């Protein structure tokens, strides 16, 4: 048994993918369009889906936004240098919280940066 992925709904897939590939070093593992359901799925990550947990991004073409609650916490990512990754995301124009840093993606989801070791 193993954890395969966590899924999040996004209002703009291309903005979501820019954050996960520019502010973070994720690779597009697979993307799939379903016109019959008017949505697109994209899997982003590091290793192959067969080898590690990925992030699933759902984009329902008809939704302008999603009401995030206070139940969902965050997605934690292991980084080499927390301050650097945080500075790079700040420089790209992304929101940052003001060894451990917090970013938020274009939809408002929180990403926890944890420096390898700790």
Binding residues for succinate: 38
Q: Decide: helix, strand or coil at residue 69.
A: coil
> From the list 22, 31, 53, 95, which residue makes contact with a second copy (rule: CB under 8 A)?
53
Which residue of 15, 28, 76, 92 would you call a contact of Ni ion, by CB under 5 A?
76
| Cα dihedral 78/16/41/76 (nearest 10) | 20
Quote the least distance from Cβ 1 to Ni ion, whole Å.
Answer: 15
Residues lying near a second copy in the complex (CB under 8 A) are found at 1-9, 24-26, 45-47, 52-56, 58, 66-80, 107-109, 112, 114
């Amino acid at each position: 048994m193993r954890i395969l992925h966590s899924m999040l709904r996004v209002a703009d897939l291309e903005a979501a993918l820019e954050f996960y590939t520019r502010a973070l070093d994720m690779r597009l593992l697979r993307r799939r369009d379903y016109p019959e359901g008017r949505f697109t799925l994209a899997f982003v990550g590091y290793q192959d889906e067969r080898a590690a947990a990925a992030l699933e991004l759902t984009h329902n073409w008809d939704r302008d936004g999603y009401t995030q609650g206070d139940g969902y916490g965050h997605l934690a990512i292991e980084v080499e240098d927390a301050a650097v990754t945080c500075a790079r995301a700040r420089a790209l124009g992304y929101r940052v919280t003001r060894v451990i840093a917090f970013l938020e993606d274009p939809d408002g989801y929180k990403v926890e940066l944890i420096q390898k070791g700790t």
